[PDB]
From a paper:
The 5-bladed fragment, however, did not form a 10-bladed propeller, even though it was dimeric, as observed in solution. Rather, the dimer adopted an unusual, asymmetric structure, hitherto unseen in natural proteins, in which one monomer formed the expected 5 blades of an incomplete propeller, while the other monomer formed only four blades and converted part of the N-terminal fifth blade to a helix, leaving the rest of this blade unstructured. The blades in one monomer were antiparallel to the blades in the other, as opposed to natural propellers, where the blades are always parallel. Thus, while the fold is clearly built of blades, it is not a propeller. As the stretch of sequence preceding the helix was not resolved in the structure, we analyzed the intactness of the crystallized protein and found that it had undergone partial trimming during crystallization. Instead, one monomer changes orientation, improving the geometry at one of the two interfaces, and compensates for the accumulated tension at the other interface by conversion of its N-terminal blade to a helix, thus also reducing to nine the number of blades that have to be accommodated in the structure. The change in its genetic information is not large, going from 2, 3, 4, or seven repeat units to 5, but it is certainly discontinuous and leads to the sudden emergence of a new form, which – as a stable, efficiently folded protein – is available for further evolution.
Residue numbers in the entry:
A (entry chain B): 32 to 207
B (entry chain A): 7 to 205
The structure:
């Protein structure tokens, strides 16, 4: 199934988060060079353009059911979109570029990874639930455990950290 | 299944319904079409330098191509569908994982170097260690196996309760991560010992 967590546990600072494939494998989403996210099918047919961010989009993810898309931007926000292109929510609270984003397995929680050295957890109504503090540099990747109760973050500080939903730091994995 | 993106992030590959692999830029324009496979492509990988593409197919072959579309080699030797492909960190060795229960290792000039025999069911995934000397395979048989390049089996990592679909090494090469349909990720050392389970 989803390789985000393997990639966050073992991947490099340079791992690329601006392309995502839908869970059914039929749709590709790409953070494009024009402040949009574009969706296309495997034949190459353009399906949708997600317009709203005011600067570069760096991270994209699909919800586990494929119906919601999250985009992470240099504009310091995450935006949530329906696959028909409508903007559903803007998640405000990071203080710098947002590099990466992930959905929880149940689709109800969003995690974001920012240049501000934090991961933030959010619900779909756009409310901030938790801020995970401790990395000493920009956070480039984030993922959930398969049961959705542990969050993994990966940072330019060369560590991976494991956290629970109440913000407790469970483990730091060093040499990354 | 049948998608990849280049290490620099600027090229997206995807297997198409028509048995080709398409390469797109990040704006959804077509760059190249890789034509040659006679049935579905299940696995695509880019080499670390981003200059070579490997495709794994139901036609029992892996094809190697350059990024302007030219077929370079066809890797013939699996006896059933090839599900996964990986390149070694130096780009010189390719590993392929097949429904035939084997991993095969190949030079980028197409020669079969080794066949890694031991799994009792389909092999879904394969990875090289950062130093290129150890291969890990993830199988439907619920194990990850670790191998050297001479094809010798070094360890079998036992503990997942369902098929293992994904495997990778930590950046320092001393920890192996496995992901399974049992809804866990396990971390292991090279002596095959379980370090932790992530639910």
């Amino acid at each position: 199934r989803n390789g985000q967590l393997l990639q966050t546990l073992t991947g490099h600072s340079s791992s690329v988060w601006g392309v995502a494939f839908s869970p059914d494998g039929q749709t590709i989403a790409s953070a494009s060079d024009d402040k949009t996210v574009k969706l296309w099918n495997r034949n190459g047919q353009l399906l949708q353009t997600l317009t709203g961010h005011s600067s570069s989009v760096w991270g994209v993810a699909f919800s586990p059911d494929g119906q919601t898309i999250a985009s992470a931007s240099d504009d310091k926000t995450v935006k949530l979109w329906n696959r028909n292109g409508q903007l559903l929510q803007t998640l405000t609270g990071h203080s710098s570029s947002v590099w990466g984003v992930a959905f929880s397995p149940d689709g109800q929680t969003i995690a974001s990874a920012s240049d501000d050295k934090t991961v933030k957890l959010w619900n779909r109504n756009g409310q901030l639930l938790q801020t995970l503090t401790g990395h000493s540099s920009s956070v480039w990747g984030v993922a959930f455990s398969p049961d959705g109760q542990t969050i993994a973050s990966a940072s330019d500080d060369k560590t991976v950290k494991l956290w629970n939903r109440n913000g407790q730091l469970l483990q730091t994995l060093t040499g990354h």
